[PDB]
Design a protein around this ligand. Structure first.
Ligand code: CAC
Length: 504
């Protein structure tokens, strides 16, 4: 009166929806509420969830604050009683009236899966929830057989919480051999009759899936619009569970869903490596990753690692912390490694090395043939003084990593050089198993001087340090790995990557 909104073109609307396809630990949206002069409020406030705690309900704090100041009553559904790695549902003020916030609908999960079942078709079952938009002109009946009260969905978004004695159940079939999923979102009445509301189809990439939800009944004034923007992820170390959301193409619905597979013991395969070595404790810890090795996830937030140079320094603010990553290399398409630390003004804290890669499928690991791989590496050795390897582009005399891989004998042989070194400082010997390798890193008998480069200073020696690595890319044309050891006799953390060679 008069109400002005931004004129959104169809192109802009698609772009907006496309943005919502970015993988994240979770997502949350506000339940729409009409201001007095408007007749329709779309679903518009859709935020990523970046915290990693399963006990934190997205925006429940914001809601309880408003509820309390208005004597409301907050109720929260998460599925916390069934799921171990995912949460899905709503937090809602059930005695809501007027123009104040009603609540939120969300999903989130922890430990995006780094191992998937090897193959076959696996069943996941869970629940789903939703909020509609608010619309006076959507033919939503004053009396609704499915939803409680007067004019459900008309002035305030209607939700799964408002249903009359109905349960909202989800079922999925994941075909891990073809990386495809299908599913059904159903409603069950008190008389135990099921009605299919949406069919879901999606493709799996990394530990995420992207696809669509097709409304089964387009005459439904609330659950009647298709989505071409469904996205979710597998969660748990071994894809024990899933969770995701979809947004109706007209922003008239935001649905979330969860799922859990049965107790059957399945064989799994590694799809992702993503970890870091702390350069003070020389301990390894896992990083969150969604299957894109060129994206570094810190505190549920992302750092693009790609850049114009051989290796690139990225500097990103994450929760008031200035993170710095030096990521190598531009010739590696399916993996990245390098340094990571917190910029503490002039100093630096939590110095670490990281490595990420997208594992080759086991059935694409070559069965025979001998290949050279060439790349570089990053390392810290400490034994009184510090010795360092910093990733570089000098194949002749730099910090070279060189490998001979014999796929026939399932052997990897590697050499890690110091700059100017004529003999390597580390020798790697490993066995190939599935899409990775494991073995040892050894210095020579009498090892290498901590360069310095001093005629009184010490020498470092390491014996049978455990090495873990993977093959990355469609046909294992890239390889990488790491090793770490903590000792008073000397310590080391090292990451390396290399690119398969062709004889020119
Ligand atoms: C193109 As890629 C290695 O980020 O899947």
């Amino acid at each position: 009166k008069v109400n002005y909104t931004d004129e959104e073109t169809q192109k802009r609307k698609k772009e907006e929806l496309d943005k919502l396809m970015e993988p994240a630990l979770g997502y949350v949206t506000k339940i729409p509420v009409n201001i007095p002069s408007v007749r329709k409020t779309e679903i518009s406030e859709i935020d990523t969830v970046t915290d990693e705690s399963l006990s934190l309900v997205p925006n429940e704090d914001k809601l309880r604050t408003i509820a309390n100041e208005n004597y409301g009553s907050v109720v929260t559904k998460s599925g916390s009683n069934t799921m171990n790695f995912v949460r899905s549902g709503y937090t809602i003020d059930v005695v809501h009236y007027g123009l104040r916030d009603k609540g939120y609908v969300y999903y989130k999960g922890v430990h995006p899966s780094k191992e998937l079942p090897k193959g076959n078709i696996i069943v996941y079952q869970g629940e789903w929830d939703f909020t509609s938009n608010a619309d006076l002109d959507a033919k939503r009946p004053n009396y609704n057989p499915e939803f409680n009260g007067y004019g459900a969905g008309q002035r305030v978004g209607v939700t799964s919480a408002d249903a009359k004695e109905r349960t909202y159940i989800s079922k999925f079939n994941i075909d891990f051999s073809n990386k495809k999923l299908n599913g059904q979102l159903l409603t069950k009445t008190k008389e135990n009759q099921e009605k299919l509301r949406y069919t879901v189809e999606a493709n799996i990439s990394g530990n995420r899936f992207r696809g669509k939800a097709t409304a089964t009944d387009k005459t439904d004034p609330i659950l009647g619009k298709d989505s071409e923007h469904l996205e979710g992820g597998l969660y748990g170390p071994k894809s024990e569970e899933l969770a995701g959301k979809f947004v109706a193409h007209d922003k008239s619905l935001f649905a979330v869903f969860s799922g859990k597979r049965g107790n059957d013991v399945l064989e799994t395969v590694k799809i992702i490596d993503a970890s870091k070595i702390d350069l003070t404790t020389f301990e390894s810890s896992e990083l969150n990753n969604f299957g894109n090795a060129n994206v570094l996830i810190i505190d549920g937030q992302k750092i693009d690692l790609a850049g114009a140079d051989f290796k690139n320094r990225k500097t990103v603010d994450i929760n008031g912390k200035t993170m710095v990553a030096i990521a190598c290399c531009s010739n590696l398409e399916y993996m990245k490694f390098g340094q990571l630390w917190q910029k503490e003004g002039e100093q630096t804290k939590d110095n670490s090395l990281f490595l990420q890669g997208e594992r080759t499928a086991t059935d694409k690991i070559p069965v025979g043939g001998n290949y050279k791989y060439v790349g570089t590496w990053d390392a810290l050795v400490s034994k009184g003084t510090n010795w360092v390897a910093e990733a570089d582009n000098n194949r002749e005399s730099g910090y070279r990593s060189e490998f001979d891989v014999n796929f026939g004998d399932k052997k990897v042989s590697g050499k890690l050089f110091d700059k100017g070194g004529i003999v390597p400082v580390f020798m790697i010997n490993a066995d190939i198993k599935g899409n990775g390798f494991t073995g040892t890193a050894n210095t020579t008998d009498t090892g290498f001087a901590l360069d310095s480069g001093s005629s009184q200073h010490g020498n470092a020696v390491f014996s049978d340090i455990k090495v873990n690595g993977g093959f990355y890319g469609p046909t294992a044309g890239e390889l990488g790995g790491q090793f770490h050891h903590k000792s008073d006799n000397g310590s080391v953390g090292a990451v390396f990557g290399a690119k398969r060679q062709i004889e020119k």
